[PDB]
């Protein structure tokens, strides 16, 4: 009834549908917004330019 | 026993793959990374001009 031989060996070859490959994992450079410095009013020196 | 040793070899190759991934990410999180160098000679090229 279970499609076996007299000895109990199966009569149908099985299958498993091989797992889908390794996986690639990557990293990336991340950048963010950056500002600059400010300028204040200047002092008056005692010496010439 | 040979099958076990071969299986450990697969784990050895997987570890090596992760090792090169960590090296590449460390190169990108470096302080003197690609972005810093690009802006430094970009700024200096304009100044040199």
Residues of A with Cβ-Cβ distance to B10 under 8 angstroms: none
Q: Helix, strand, coil shares of chain B as percentages rounded to 5?
A: 90, 0, 10
Please say whether the beta carbons of A10 and A3 come within 8 A: yes
User: Which residues make beta-bridge pairs with A10?
Assistant: A4
CA atoms of B17 and B11, how far apart (whole Å): 10
Please provide the size of chain B in residues.
49
CA atoms of B36 and A32, how far apart (whole Å): 12
Experimental method: X-ray
CA atoms of B46 and B49, how far apart (whole Å): 5
Structure tokens at B23: 């090296």
Please say whether the beta carbons of A29 and B28 come within 8 A: yes
Rounded to a whole number, what is the distance in Å from the CA of A43 to chain B's nearest CA?
27
> Number of residue pairs across A and B with CB atoms under 8 Å?
11
- Chain A residue with Cα closest to B36: A31
Q: Choose from A28, A29, A33, A34 for mutation: most chain B CBs within 10 A.
A: A29
Alpha carbon distance, N-terminus to C-terminus of chain A: 109
- DSSP letter, residue A10: B
């Amino acid at each position: 009834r279970h499609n076996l031989s007299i000895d109990g060996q199966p009569l149908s070859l099985a299958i498993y549908a091989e797992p889908t490959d390794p996986k690639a994992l990557l990293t990336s450079m991340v950048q963010a917004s950056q500002g600059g410095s400010a300028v204040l009013p200047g002092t008056l020196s005692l010496y010439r330019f | 026993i040979r099958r076990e040793a071969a299986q450990m070899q697969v784990e050895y190759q997987e570890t090596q793959q992760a090792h090169t991934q960590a090296q590449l990410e460390l190169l990108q999180r470096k302080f003197t990374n690609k972005a810093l160098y690009s802006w430094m000679r970009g700024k200096l090229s304009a100044i040199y001009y």
